[PDB]
């Protein structure tokens, strides 16, 4: 069903609800079938996955029937389809993690070039639109270039990355000096 976009280095919460509004057993796993985490009573057990240290739940919410999966310090390679198994019902959440960095250049001079590169999971087909501080709207794809920065381009750029019909927004600080 659901598709969720996350940002590299940030944290996401994938949701799972039971029709029952009481505390019952549940577990999460990835598409490669490897168990992420689940429970015995209200004892949380983590599993084998490469997600181990970065995966957690929210123990306090189990009573209302929220058994969320929380994944911290997101990597691009956390992009996967995740599956929540509750009351023998299955609930599917697809995660795509994107990153957007200035190559190796945030402090530039007037007249110089800016080039941002987008990082995305396998099979993606994204595009990027940024707005400069002076409100000029710029398009790109894997790469986004500005060839001749002005003094008014110094400040926070707001860049939105879109895959099909879901978007994630970035803020990038760029210094342009004389």
């Amino acid at each position, epitope marked *: 069903k659901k598709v969720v976009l996350g940002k590299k280095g940030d944290t996401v919460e994938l949701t799972c609800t039971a029709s029952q509004k009481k505390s019952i057993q549940f577990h999460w796993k990835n598409s*490669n079938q490897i168990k992420i985490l689940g429970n015995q009573g209200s004892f949380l057990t983590k599993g084998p996955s490469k997600l181990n240290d970065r995966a957690d739940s929210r123990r306090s919410l189990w009573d209302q029937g929220n058994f969320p999966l929380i994944i911290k310090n997101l990597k691009i*390679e956390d*992009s996967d*389809t995740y599956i929540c198994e509750v009351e023998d019902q299955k609930e599917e959440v697809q995660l795509l993690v994107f990153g957007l960095t200035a190559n190796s250049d945030t402090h530039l001079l007037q007249g110089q070039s800016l080039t941002l590169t987008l990082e995305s999971p*396998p*099979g993606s*087909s994204p*595009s990027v639109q940024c707005r400069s501080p002076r409100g000029k709207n710029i398009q790109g*794809g894997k790469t986004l270039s500005v060839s001749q920065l002005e003094l008014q381009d110094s400040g926070t750029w707001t860049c939105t990355v879109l895959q*099909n019909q879901k978007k994630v927004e970035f803020k990038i600080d760029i210094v342009v000096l004389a």
Partner: antibody
Amino acid sequence: QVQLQQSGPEVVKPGASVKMSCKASGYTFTSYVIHWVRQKPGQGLDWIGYINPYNDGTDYDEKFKGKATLTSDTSTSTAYMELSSLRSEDTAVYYCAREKDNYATGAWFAYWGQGTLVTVSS
Amino acid sequence: DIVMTQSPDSLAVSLGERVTMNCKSSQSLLYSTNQKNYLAWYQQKPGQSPKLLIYWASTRESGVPDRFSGSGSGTDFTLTISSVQAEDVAVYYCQQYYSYRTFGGGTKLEIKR
């Protein structure tokens, strides 16, 4: 059944521009990415780039940046490719193709147009 | 871009024999996370558009005869035709969709009779 119907063959002069179309049907236009691909006569397939019809966002292979421009019309369910500053070596069949699925779950080209042959000559 | 290399460029095979076509990428197409290879094969018969045969390296598209099979992993892949039929004359392309999209240069299949 999904179909991609491309415009007819065209001659175009060395140095000018051509604009061709790809009409999609049998599915919701803004749901899937459309790609374009070049095939020079007797040669292989060169991926050009793609358009996300949802917001007309775009991406181009290195080789085609500045050479091609992709747009789409949501109401008529049609994607366009324009090629500019054409030279003799640009003579080719150009295909549009649709990804099988979205959100990286069907990234291969499951549906193809029949191609548009563009000849570059004065 | 990832570079896709096919070999040989062309192949002649007697009706009914087995055919193997190789595709090599400049970098791994195996996604460690889901263990899937982001690789497809297409068939392009003379005069026609390419047609999808195989995706995820080895899943046969619906309607494709099971004489067509894919294999390989990481950076090296094979398309096999277990017993070539007359209708199989075509050029075969592999395509990676791991990071953007790139096609190999094709293998043309000819038939001996």
